[PDB]
Amino acid sequence: YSSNPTFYLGIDCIIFGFNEGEISLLLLKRNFEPAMGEWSLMGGFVQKDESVDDAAKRVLAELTGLENVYMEQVGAFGAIDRDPGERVVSIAYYALININEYDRELVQKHNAYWVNINELPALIFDHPEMVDKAREMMKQKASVEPIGFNLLPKLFTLSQLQSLYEAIYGEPMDKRNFRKRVAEMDFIEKTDKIDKLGSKRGAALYKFNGKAYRKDPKFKL
Amino acid sequence: YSSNPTFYLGIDCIIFGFNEGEISLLLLKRNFEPAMGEWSLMGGFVQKDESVDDAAKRVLAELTGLENVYMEQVGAFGAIDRDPGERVVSIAYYALININEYDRELVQKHNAYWVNINELPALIFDHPEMVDKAREMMKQKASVEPIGFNLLPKLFTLSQLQSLYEAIYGEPMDKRNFRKRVAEMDFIEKTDKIDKLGSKRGAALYKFNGKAYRKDPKFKL
């Protein structure tokens, strides 16, 4: 153990949200050094008293004030010169949150903004490569697991769910087949509530229950 | 950067091979401390002069003498007490090699043995959890990419290819549909060579060319 070097261990969060048709990431225009004024993911460092997963949770809560967040580890990024300051190996995670539900004041302190995932600014270091990989993993996984519902409020319309999925895959779906495919899922249940987008339009709301899903975990959408 | 701790950065390789129907891992019965006499993955440590990926390659070559090996990063394992000695965060990779082709002498020095992935001994620390995750990733990926061919010699029979796939999924396939599905792949080409398993039996040999695959990269098996 002792003849080997030690490394600063970074945490970087790719924070996904969904709103009005598009998938956005929560990014920081850095107040601080290095690369001041440039865009980046939310970052921190693993501490001696916490696991790497717990560091991810802390860093995310620091920005958002959110806990019990769906998170996935993306990977350990460890090119020698990835960060020009000192050597840092960073573990990237992605997170899927409800965009109506984070802590606005914390976001303001970090000087963070939501940006459309298809219209991102240049990001520092190897952050573009972290985003690319997290996207692929998320697309891969959201086609066989119900992880997408973390991006939606507890109650959602089918129009929104469809729109979510079109945004995830950058491709429009057949409305007919989609609606059917959802009706065949018992754990996506139709409620007797409606979304009132303005005085003159409504739409039926659904909810996902993970009890019904976990008793029969079949998902493909 | 400087107010944060630094960590020993481990490398752990899950080394997959394929032979006579079954998938095996190359494991070490440790000559050395800690946990002497117990079974583990092949490990090392990231050095100051190498990227994390390059450390993975080195550690694997140390045991096998192999280079240009198909490898995938599995993840950063960072529970505080994962390794009871000092704190180590370890990056697990998996590797897919041709079992006829490694360096026997290096394997002997490390006191490593091939073991059936379904009949593994107890492994130390969080190595079981690394193996579990690498298996899932490998199964997931080998169903949509031609990564399986790294586990086979350059020339293979369809009987072997089938057998490989049955072992990957722990499930027998329909011989008929399988054979057809392969005929529909131009990049799996039939040669005029035969495997001579003993004096009295042969079978037609095929090869994968990644040129033909990369020009039209469609794979599902």
Author numbering:
A (entry chain A), B (entry chain A): 5 to 225
Task: Quote the study's own text.
In this study we identified and characterized a novel L-arabinose-responsive transcription factor found in the Bacteroides species, which belongs to the NrtR family of Nudix-related transcriptional regulators. The NrtR family transcription factors are characterized by an N-terminal Nudix hydrolase-like effector-binding domain and a C-terminal DNA-binding domain. In this work, genome-scale regulon inference using the comparative genomics approach revealed that the NrtR family AraR regulators in Bacteroides and Prevotella spp. control not only the L-arabinose catabolic operons, but also several other gene loci involved in the utilization of arabinose-containing polysaccharides. The predicted AraR-regulated operons are involved in the uptake and catabolism of L-arabinose and the decomposition of arabinose-containing polysaccharides (e.g., arabinan, arabinoxylan, pectic galactan) to oligosaccharides, their translocation into the periplasm, and further hydrolysis.
We determined the structures of full-length apo–BtAraR protein, its complex with a specific DNA duplex, and its complex with the L-arabinose effector. The solved structures provide a first view of the structural mechanism underlying the regulatory function of the L-arabinose-binding Nudix domain. The Nudix signature motif GX5-EX7REUXEEXGU (where U is a hydrophobic residue and X is any residue) is strictly conserved in all known active Nudix hydrolases, but it is impaired in the NrtR regulators of NAD metabolism, several of which are known to be enzymatically inactive. Similarly to NrtR regulators, the Nudix signature motif is not conserved in the AraR proteins from Bacteroidetes, where two or three glutamate residues are substituted with other amino acids. These observations suggest that AraR regulators are also enzymatically inactive and utilize their Nudix hydrolase-like domains for ligand binding.
